[PDB]
Design a binder for these strands. Structure first.
Ligand SMILES: [Li+]
Ligand SMILES: [Li+]
Ligand SMILES: [Li+]
Length: 1223
RNA sequence: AAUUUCUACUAAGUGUAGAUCGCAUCCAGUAAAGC
DNA sequence: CTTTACTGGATGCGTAAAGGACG
DNA sequence: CGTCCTTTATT
């Protein structure tokens, strides 16, 4: 109640409502007969074409400056960029260059005298008719002579490219903010990593790529940046890091690939280079050579038959390649060699049926020489054999034959395998023989034809495996004796079998591309600015306006021939009438007031004093050093008077302006003009005459519609349906505004009506919810799946503006802090991410007490005593593998983003219900860019989506049950998050949302606050002795069958964070440890007390004998100390989880609380209403909430002027003192 | 298994509950197969 | 390195009346 | 000379 009511009418945001439009009467008939849709359909294809040529001219104009630009003082900026210590005044110096570098580039585009005419009608009527050289491209631009204003929104998309500000679409942004920092950051890495590069390695990149035209060290110089400003230069720059592939097909390595190889052999971490992003609008042709994909279905076939049939050389290559293996014995068994790699364990199996025998046979050879009888199997001898067994490049056929135990002979069993593999290829041809015939004609498009592709995929994979098998027989020699009589034939065939590798590529890239589909196309009705705005004065100009016949709204469109048809209509007293809109709007007071009252047309009529004309030009009314109060007043009084003399403004609106002596800035005056400048009203217009204007075809008319508008619906409306009703409701005092810019699309059907999945009428359908007690619905009418796509649909996109005039103006992050300082029992919601639970909620009160905790793997809703629980976590898993296995098999890739978004809508609702009920703030994890990456297949892309749709919902929060006119309803929705502009603008707090660090959120004891600040990984014998002696005591407690480890953290290093210091550890409980190598489980449950006893017996230790600290240090053997750490590590292994297993994810603590009992999360997961976390996941969210409860505690001390100075970001040291004092 | 549209439904009969910012442009990211 | 897919973040607009060109 | 398309103006 109390907190939420304050946040209404806070800021201005826009949304868009969408509606199926349905033609009224003869409207569609006259539309078809006048071919209006086909002209817009043909236009929307031509409009994408004219835009392509327009990009051609922009890119040319773009590169005229970027080729010849040289940046002033680029070096001087770069030095400041890599400064190790910048001061806050020195900090300000770097910006002004960076601001001027964008200014230097941005003005260089504008500096051309042809800049301004790139975004006016001249570019289509004049400039592009000159630049273009095609006779057809010249004609597609003439057809658009009428329509240049239809490009206005496209010209806006192009002036952003020439912006000077830090805007993501600006070219100046790309070159300086993005390319430079990446280039300069690479500049620092090269100096650090110059060491590893061989002089030939430097030259090989120079030889292959740079052509010795410049050296590699040249690029990382400051003054060579001007090369990479263009896309053409970047491709060369990105090549140094990435490399490229020549025409000759050699994979040249790049500096980033070399850094990895050094790091993989020496196990160090040197950073890799960042490639540079492309430049705006570049038509970038890649440098690496590739064979172009097939244009059409017919090509793919004609390649597939000709290249793969029996006659084709590729099959002939198999037909000869087998002959060599059948003739294998004839050639020297020392002249043929099997290459060495990891793929040779498979080879050992294909002969004698076992993988590791070829490895194990050779390991007996390397051992006997290099195994002196003392060792027998030291780690070095076992490990060194791994070094030798991959260094070997190949194996002689005779060297393999020696390994095998008789009778088996490699060459005879090699002759066995290959006949089998050529036959399996022969078998796929048997199934696929129909594809090859000259006659055969395809039933369905290749992408719609899963049956024909699986046939191609089967023949291609059967040919791919035989080749991929044979490739290992090359041996990369480089070999002393090669039975070159054999290999010469072998190379002749295999190089021709290598031709499939391009075909497997190109075909995969054709078959797997999404099928052709017809996008919806905007309707214009022969007007470039059709339906731009709703103002009644413009109704003739735009030619579309809204009508109302009770509970149904229509969209009327007046044909070009009859622009003023609806204006001559008057009320009919007796017969039926429509309600016709009388929309009136005054957009942009700051722009519209000077435009009209300083215009040439009215500059004479209003004679503004000589003072005025200088006041506006000198900008004395604007706030700043220029601002004068009385000067601004003179503009306000001038604008006030001239509006009163203005007829179409004064009459249309009812204007109340507070005394000019009361305004503090010109913004205050424009705001009232903006606020009082909008009026929506209706008039009466005869139904019989309007309907006559439809049948005549002078007026087209569609009904605005969604399913809530049906006369068969008795259910709660869609949230957007409410907004639409409110726009014209008389109780909407400007909260929601009908804005201009609507569009009307035509989406032709994409499915056939008869073919759809139909549940036949009067035949019982089965219900899928196992809780629904009615398992059958017998309907008297058909249910077509996706019926909305089986017929042509009209689309109407109506933008609205919510709170265009914000009354309540204050800082939201501050007002949240003010009310948390004064809430006696404030509530906090805790939301925790995971891979075992997608989202987990924990709700706590002002004292840290748990009221609610449940996982959100499954969404539960009840309606009218009907429960339904949907396992959205299962749906995301099955749909994920329905794309993985779809990607492998070339099949269709299912969409999952809708599913994820559909999941969030149920979650987004549940938090808002929780926020409404408990009046609770929200607590999320502080994640920067890095944490998005995950080791295993990730749904945490759901988490990033969870934020967006949550923040968006809180931006205007509505409950569809509250009365719209009441607070929290449709007209007065809550706004409890700062307006969403970008993810990068965010701070630690966003209104009710707090992004809090996750350190020590999970691996902490909720019962006591205990944490593992110990490092236990094994370093040496000596450190373990210093380890043990630090403890206050190590003892055996026999009456409890536990070991007790009392310690003071102050004796250990890097333990400053903990508050209590004095902790007594225990071996209580069981832990989980992962193996390092059949067996039932890949993990085991170690019993701690039953393992300390174990360890203390192996080295003859009297653990019973009082304190054991001196006793354990007595030992002199490494195996005792290296094993002790594992026992030590498990005691502190608070969180025990196992991958992929439902049962295991529990938190167990080694400390006794105030009542002497350990925290086992399992002793809670059984409870329904637990008072502590049930699992390591809920423990996270619980602490995430408490981290904020600490932040609320900070707010309780400070004073209302200074809450902005309160920092919500917890220090690691304050949090431990709080988790241990709270209990 | 209907939907402005998405998700889950059939919810008592052409639908139910929740959510839904469109349009255009620039850019990037992930997965997969081949090399 | 490439190619295909699907997916998402950051920008602009969400306008009437002046302006001009045109038959 | 009225009509339809193009430009414009910045709290
Ligand atoms: Li509804
Ligand atoms: Li995926
Ligand atoms: Li179904």
């Amino acid at each position: 109640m109390s907190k939420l009511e304050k946040f209404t009418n806070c800021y201005s945001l826009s949304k868009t409502l969408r509606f199926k439009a349905i033609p009224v009467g003869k409207t569609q008939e006259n539309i078809d007969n006048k071919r209006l849709l086909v002209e817009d359909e043909k236009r929307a294809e031509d409009y994408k074409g004219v835009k392509k040529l327009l990009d051609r001219y922009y890119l040319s104009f773009i590169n005229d400056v970027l080729h010849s630009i040289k940046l002033k003082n680029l070096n001087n900026y770069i030095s400041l960029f890599r400064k190790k210590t910048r001061t806050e005044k020195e900090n300000k110096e770097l910006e002004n260059l960076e601001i001027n570098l964008r200014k230097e580039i941005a003005k260089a585009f504008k500096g051309n005298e042809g800049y301004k005419s790139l975004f006016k009608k001249d570019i289509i009527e004049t400039i592009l008719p000159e630049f273009l050289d095609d006779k057809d491209e010249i004609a597609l631009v003439n057809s658009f002579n009428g329509f240049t204003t239809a490009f206005t929104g496209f010209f806006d998309n192009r002036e952003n490219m020439f912006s000077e500000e830090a805007k993501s679409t600006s070219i100046a942004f790309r070159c300086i903010n993005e390319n430079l920092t990446r280039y300069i950051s690479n500049m620092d890495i090269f100096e650090k990593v110059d060491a590893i590069f061989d002089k030939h390695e430097v030259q090989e990149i120079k030889e292959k790529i740079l052509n010795s035209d410049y050296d590699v060290e040249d690029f990382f110089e400051g003054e060579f940046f001007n090369f990479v400003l263009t896309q053409e230069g970047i491709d060369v720059y990105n090549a140094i890091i990435g490399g490229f592939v020549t025409e000759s097909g050699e994979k040249i390595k790049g500096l980033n690939e070399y850094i990895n190889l050094y790091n993989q052999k020496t196990k160090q971490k040197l950073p890799k280079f960042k490639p540079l992003y492309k430049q705006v609008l570049s038509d970038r042709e890649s440098l690496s050579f590739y064979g172009e994909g097939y244009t059409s279905d017919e090509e793919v076939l004609e390649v597939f038959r000709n290249t793969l049939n029996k006659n084709s050389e590729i099959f002939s290559s198999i037909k000869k390649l087998e002959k060599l293996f059948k003739n294998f014995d004839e050639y020297s068994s020392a002249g043929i060699f099997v290459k060495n790699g990891p793929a040779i364990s498979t080879i050992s199996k294909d002969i004698f049926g076992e993988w590791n025998v070829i490895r194990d046979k050779w390991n007996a050879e390397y051992d006997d020489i290099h195994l002196k009888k003392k060792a027998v199997v030291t780690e070095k001898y076992e490990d060194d054999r791994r070094k030798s067994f991959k260094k070997i490049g190949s194996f002689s056929l005779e060297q393999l034959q020696e390994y095998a135990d008789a009778d088996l002979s490699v060459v005879e069993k090699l002759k066995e395998i290959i006949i089998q593999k050529v036959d399996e290829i022969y078998k796929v041809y048997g199934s696929s023989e129909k594809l090859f015939d000259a006659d055969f004609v395809l039933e369905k498009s290749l992408k719609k034809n899963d049956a024909v592709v699986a046939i191609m995929k089967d023949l291609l994979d059967s040919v791919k495996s035989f080749e991929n098998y044979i490739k290992a027989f090359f041996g990369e020699g480089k070999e002393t004796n090669r039975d070159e009589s054999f290999y010469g034939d072998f190379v002749l065939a295999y190089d021709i079998l290598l031709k499939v590798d391009h075909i497997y590529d190109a075909i995969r890239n054709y078959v797997t591309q999404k099928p052709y589909s017809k996008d919806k196309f905007k309707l214009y009705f022969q007007n470039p600015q059709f339906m731009g705005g709703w103002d009644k004065d413009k109704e003739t100009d735009y030619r579309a306006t809204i009508l109302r016949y009770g509970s149904k709204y229509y969209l009327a469109i007046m044909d070009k021939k009859y622009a003023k048809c609806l204006q001559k209509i008057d009320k009919d007293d007796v017969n039926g009438n429509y309600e016709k809109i009388n929309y009136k709007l005054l957009p942009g007071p700051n722009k519209m007031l000077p435009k009209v009252f300083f215009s040439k047309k009215w500059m004479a009529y209003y004679n503004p004093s000589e003072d005025i004309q200088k006041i506006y030009k000198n900008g004395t009314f604007k706030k700043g050093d220029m601002f004068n109060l009385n000067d601004c007043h003179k503009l306000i009084d001038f604008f006030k008077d001239s509006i009163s003399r203005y007829p179409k403004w004064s009459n249309a609106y009812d204007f109340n302006f507070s005394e000019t002596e009361k305004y503090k800035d010109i913004a205050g005056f424009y705001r009232e003009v903006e606020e009082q400048g909008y009026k929506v009203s209706f008039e009466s217009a005869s139904k019989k005459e309007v309907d006559k204007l439809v049948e005549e075809g002078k007026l087209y008319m569609f009904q605005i519609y969604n399913k809530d508008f049906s006369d068969k619906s008795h259910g709660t409306p869609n949230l957007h349906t409410m907004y639409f009703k409110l726009l014209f409701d008389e109780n909407n005092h400007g909260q929601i505004r009908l804005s201009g810019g609507a569009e009307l699309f035509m989406r032709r059907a994409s499915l056939k009506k008869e073919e759809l999945v139909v549940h036949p009428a009067n035949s019982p359908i089965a219900n899928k919810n196992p809780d629904n007690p009615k398992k059958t619905t017998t309907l008297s009418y058909d249910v077509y799946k996706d019926k909305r796509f089986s017929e042509d649909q009209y689309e109407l996109h109506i933008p609205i503006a919510i709170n265009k005039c914000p009354k309540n103006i204050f800082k939201i992050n501050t007002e949240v802090r003010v009310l948390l300082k004064h809430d006696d029992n404030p509530y906090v919601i805790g939301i925790d991410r995971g891979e075992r639970n997608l989202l987990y909620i924990v709700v706590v009160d002002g004292k840290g007490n748990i009221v609610e905790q449940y996982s959100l793997n499954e969404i539960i809703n009840n309606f009218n005593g009907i429960r339904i629980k949907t396992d959205y976590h299962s749906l995301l898993d099955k749909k994920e593998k329905e794309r993985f296995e779809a990607r492998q098999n070339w099949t269709s890739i299912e969409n999952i983003k809708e599913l994820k978004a559909g999941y969030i809508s149920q979650v987004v609702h549940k938090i808002c219900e929780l926020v409404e009920k408990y009046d609770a703030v929200i607590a999320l994890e502080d994640l920067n860019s890095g944490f998005k990456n995950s080791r295993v297949k990730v749904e945490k892309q759901v988490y990033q989506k969870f934020e967006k749709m949550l923040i968006d919902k809180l931006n205007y929060m509505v409950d569809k049950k509250s009365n719209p006119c009441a607070t929290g309803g449709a007209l007065k929705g809550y706004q409890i998050t700062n307006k969403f502009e970008s993810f990068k603008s965010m701070s630690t707090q966003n209104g009710f949302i707090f992004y809090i660090p996750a350190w020590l959120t999970s691996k902490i004891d909720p019962s006591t606050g205990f944490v593992n600040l110990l490092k236990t990984k094994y370093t040496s014998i000596a450190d373990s002795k210093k380890f043990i002696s630090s403890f206050d005591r190590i003892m055996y407690v026999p009456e409890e069958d536990l070991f007790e480890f009392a310690l003071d953290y102050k004796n250990f290093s890097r333990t400053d964070a903990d508050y209590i210091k004095k902790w007594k550890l225990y071996s209580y409980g069981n832990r989980i440890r992962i193996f390092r190598n059949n067996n039932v489980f890949d993990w085991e449950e170690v019993c701690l007390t039953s393992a300390y006893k174990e360890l203390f017996n192996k080295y003859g230790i009297n653990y019973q004998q009082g304190d054991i600290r001196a006793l354990l240090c007595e030992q002199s053997d490494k195996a005792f100390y290296s094993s002790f750490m594992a026992l030590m590590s498990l005691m502190l292994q608070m969180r025990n989880s196992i991958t992929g297993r439902t049962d295991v994810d529990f938190l167990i603590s080694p400390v006794k609380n105030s009542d002497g009992i350990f925290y086992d999360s399992r002793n809670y997961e059984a409870q329904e209403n637990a008072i502590l976390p049930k699992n390591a996941d809920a423990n996270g969210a619980y602490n995430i909430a408490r981290k904020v409860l600490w932040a609320i505690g900070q707010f309780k001390k400070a004073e209302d002027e200074k809450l902005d100075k309160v920092k919500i970001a917890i220090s690691n040291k304050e949090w431990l003192e709080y988790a241990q004092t709270s209990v």
